[model samples]
Target chain A: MTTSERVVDLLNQAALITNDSKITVLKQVQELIINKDPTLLDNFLDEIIAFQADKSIEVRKFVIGFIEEACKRDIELLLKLIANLNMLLRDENVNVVKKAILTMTQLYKVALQWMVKSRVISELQEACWDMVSAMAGDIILLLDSDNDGIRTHAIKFVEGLIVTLSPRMADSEIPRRQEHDISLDRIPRDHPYIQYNVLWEEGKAALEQLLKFMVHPAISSINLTTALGSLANIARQRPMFMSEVIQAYETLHANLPPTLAKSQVSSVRKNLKLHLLSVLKHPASLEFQAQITTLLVDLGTPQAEIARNMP
Target chain B: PLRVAVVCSSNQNRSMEAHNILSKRGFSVRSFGTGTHVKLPGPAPDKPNVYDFKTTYDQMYNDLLRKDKELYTQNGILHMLDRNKRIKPRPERFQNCKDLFDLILTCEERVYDQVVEDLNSREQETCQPVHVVNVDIQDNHEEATLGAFLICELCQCIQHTEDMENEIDELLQEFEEKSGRTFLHTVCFY
Candidate 1:
């Protein structure tokens, strides 16, 4: 039998089969997808989709990875595959849920780019957004989960959402950094995506919530460091939040969480200063130069070095 | 093996040197020129020997040998061509290649810009991502030889890493610190 036929046959038997067979089938499917052969998908989309609900955890996890890779090649697959993503989000297994969350984090960004570039949406795309947005809220709630692993990934997912929704500079404006990231330029002024305003508001609300973790008394040192790192990145790319981000850093520096151990306290202070030293040279943070330098000095940086870093 | 592509303004020197070294090291490699013409130095400062992409390295070597063998030999152009001829038939154009590469290393910032823009201008037939990295190296013989070794070392480092997509930034950072050479890296889709 042909490799395609063997893959389809294995997929049909995957329900009762062992993990090895399911993995081999997925590998074959991945190979076909990478090669961009039309027949593999045209002949076997539904058969492979059935693996989403397989009893084996390994098979289920592989399907998530396969779906993520497949969606990149064909945007239309997202419309067909939205239901599987939603189902996995509510799975009993935590790792499965984590995989789904991570996939959604990237896929949501990819989907937004496609939607804006296409300038129009199908009914399938519309419904898919509704489901994606709902899963997004569900993922945001995982930040409060008892599982440390889930919360860490959820933080990154939150980062993804905020970065995607942050405003971009217009094409006419020069990039603040040396590297020209035209990929990140604003959606054209004339052809704004219809959902831009709605999602922009959501981005603002989500960022406000994320900043809460930076100062939360019960937050772990790891979470605190993670939140600070994520915020520092947000400040670099999103000028709209630079001032507020700098202010947040100052407040945290004034009084870190009392429960942090000596090393934890030292580690947190170091990253804050590290982020500030870089942010000091950023264009949008010019007004904060005086404030940041003062904080850096209080955190043990010498004045001469701080002054040299200044423009 | 990593599918690597090295690019420069003229594929004659820096990129070709890298291609030769990397190929010998067992990597799947290709070299390309981003320039409008493959220009080689002539006897006079104002004059240059230029050829189209279709011209073979053997033809160029033979033509230059006949025209002014001693001058080209003095400049090391003949030696460079002799090396290039053994590696490939002709210098390829970057914009003309349809084959996808996992990594593309450009010798200068200008070549980096052309490669990135060329990749971006293409239709998104497949959304596979390729990393375009630039390490600024002078266009002279000694620097090209030095830069080629550095390029090979970076490739060696890349080969050991399991997840290049996520680890490239940290890898580039470490490489920059160790070699004291800053690099420009970005990801563009095919």
Candidate 2:
């Protein structure tokens, strides 16, 4: 058999192994990779990426482990896998979409250096922005989810988006001006670049809207806390544009119901107190602090602890 | 048998907990924290004080207190020394343990640039070979669960597949040749 066939056979065999036996099978697969077989590795990776759409959680776990191993070998292929996996970003299975995003993050991290090296920062940036735009509605709806996991993931997605976008915006080499100015007149609307840029713009708009939505008084306290944290991170990178976020947080903290505001019984309040303290501890600047101090003071006793400890 | 040594900022909480867990599972676990004499209760005596097997907590604590009072003093915030000079060691408080642990973990991340400065001078007399294991616990949320689930999926899907590994090796070889850099560049920090 050709090397590719041998590799495919091995992957098929591994897939058939019971979940309990997966660790051993994975070890054997790792050893095979270490032994230096190219065709086998490539075919195996292709199959694993394909299996990301599987409904079974066990299958998803197996694919993730396999992808991690692949990442250890060929990050370029991993990047391709991310691109492919993006198709499942809107899969009916929430678990599947979540898994795909998680895997994409790993791929992004592993291939980041290369992406930066290859000057594909625009591609990565656009891909991220596109995903955010595509998922913004669903994400916002899930933000107030009673399920701690969904709520946390929604918060993380927003946080991750802020972190991802801020750095790309800061990177001098990312061709921001050119990208911002890319004309639809010169490129067909259906073209990949133009389509990506459109999606990017939509994503940017969605993020701004989401930011606004976070401050809407109707939102849940849990979501507001997460949004405030997300905004704080964004404010760290771009204070000028993010001051609105700071203001929102101040308003939210001030208006919190006495039950939420004063409840030491809830760990959530402690987390909120900590979050606010962190904001005050690392205030944007003296001017920013001066403007926000009154609002900070209104957060009551916690503000005093923060002010006393402020460096 | 692996001679595992788990190191944290203080020997009191995380490392002690880790040592207990690992030792219970039949691993010869030893734990050391950067800070000495963490006044927090020692792991159960039978639970094995891998780091303090030969040394008492009081002896270690005093030795550490004398050698690095600054760290001990800071650690005191979690245990005894509050701002008002309260000598309250809340040994039963797991949150207190967690707070102390965060400080120690922060120090380990910077281990490359800083010598483990908090070790007691006399206690540093002999070095023991330890298999160090770092444990990072993620919050039990859907995101983490989903991430874990995906990882498992990747593992399941790529089962026994040797072809992908071979292709990856080829890619790395090509990458090395084209970039005129070692294959290690493919995996190592950029």
Please state the interface RMSD for every predicted structure, separated by commas.
Answer: 12.2, 23.5
- After superposition, the stretches of candidate 1 with alpha carbons farther than 4 Å from their true spots are A1-3, A9-17, A20-25, A170-193, A303-308, B1-190
Estimate, for each residue in A31-103, the C-alpha lDDT of model 2 and write its tens digit: 5753457446764555556666555665665565566557657655544554445555545555545554455
Cα-based lDDT for every prediction: 0.75, 0.42
Q: lDDT score, residue A189, model 2?
A: 40
Q: Is the docking of candidate 2 incorrect, acceptable, medium or high quality?
A: incorrect
Model 1 per-residue lDDT at A152: 58
Model 2 lDDT at residue A127 = 65
Mark the 10 consecutive residues where model 1 chain B has the least summed lDDT. Answer: B120-129
In terms of TM-score, how similar is model 1 to the real structure? 0.57
Tens digits of per-residue lDDT for model 1, A1-311:
87676666666665556655668757766776445475577467776667777877767778887787778777778887888887887788766777787788768877766766776767778777677787888888878876544665677778767866766643122224323222233455455344556777888878887887667787664466567766766776676788778988988988779986554465466557767876787777788787888899899998786876675
